[PDB]
Write a protein that binds this DNA or RNA. Structure first.
Ligand code: DGT
Ligand code: MN
Ligand code: MN
Length: 174
DNA sequence: GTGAGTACA
DNA sequence: CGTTCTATGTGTACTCAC
DNA sequence: ATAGAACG
């Protein structure tokens, strides 16, 4: 375990140091395209792991953008990886800590953040509401009866509100 | 080289 | 009848027949 | 959020 002060330090260092190797020359992951989520974005006092959400700008880099990932100048061991979820352990200070990573394309941004900030209890509650209205909300979208439901939205609030729910900051999300 | 059961969110 | 407790979801990456 | 069930 590690604190929000530790986490904040760790996430800030990484945002200089991320990139993936796309067939030789490695293309630099721009930090305006990475977003701290889960506990750290809710600003909980104590952290179990740092969970991060990378936004890809074309679909056909998902084949590359997590299983060929590098963090400059620091050690790590991989336990799992895929196109959209990739879990890593880090060596920080003398510390070993765990780092989840997650991807969505820009079309998906707020829903990935809303899904990934948690908390777990909030996600469990919030969904039942719309299953009662026979809708489905996921990392990627909002859908009904097998067809996506498009909305005129850009940020997470406009999503939560377009869904018809109290918007609140991630500290006390429940 | 399609398809159920599990692990971990 | 009011207060309170409780239940509630679903995708990714993996494994292991076939 | 939301509704049903257990309890005064
Ligand atoms: N724990 C958990 N998280 C889930 C689940 N489903 C979706 N999530 C989302 C919400 C979480 O905020 C996000 C990552 O959660 P984590 O497992 O890393 O923990 P979280 O960030 O909530 O805080 P933590 O790492 O426990 O200190 O994934 C689930 O079933 N369990
Ligand atoms: Mn976390
Ligand atoms: Mn996590």
């Amino acid at each position: 375990m590690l604190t929000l002060i530790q986490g904040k330090k760790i996430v800030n260092h990484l945002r200089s140091r991320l990139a993936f190797e796309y067939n030789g020359q490695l293309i630099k992951i721009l930090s305006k395209n990475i977003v701290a989520v889960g506990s750290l974005r809710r600003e909980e006092k104590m952290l179990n792991d740092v969970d991060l959400l990378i936004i890809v700008p074309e679909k056909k880099l998902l084949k590359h953008v997590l299983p060929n990932i590098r963090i400059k100048g620091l050690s790590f061991s991989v336990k799992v990886c895929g196109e959209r979820k990739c879990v890593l352990f880090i060596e920080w200070e003398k510390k070993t800590y765990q780092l989840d990573l997650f991807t969505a394309l820009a079309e998906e941004k707020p829903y990935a953040i809303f899904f990934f900030t948690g908390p777990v209890s909030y996600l469990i509650r919030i969904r039942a509401a719309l299953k009662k209205k026979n809708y489905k909300l996921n990392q990627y979208g909002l859908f009904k009866n097998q067809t996506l439901v498009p909305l005129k939205i850009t940020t997470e609030k406009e999503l939560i509100k377009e869904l018809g729910f109290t918007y609140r900051i991630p500290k006390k999300r429940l």
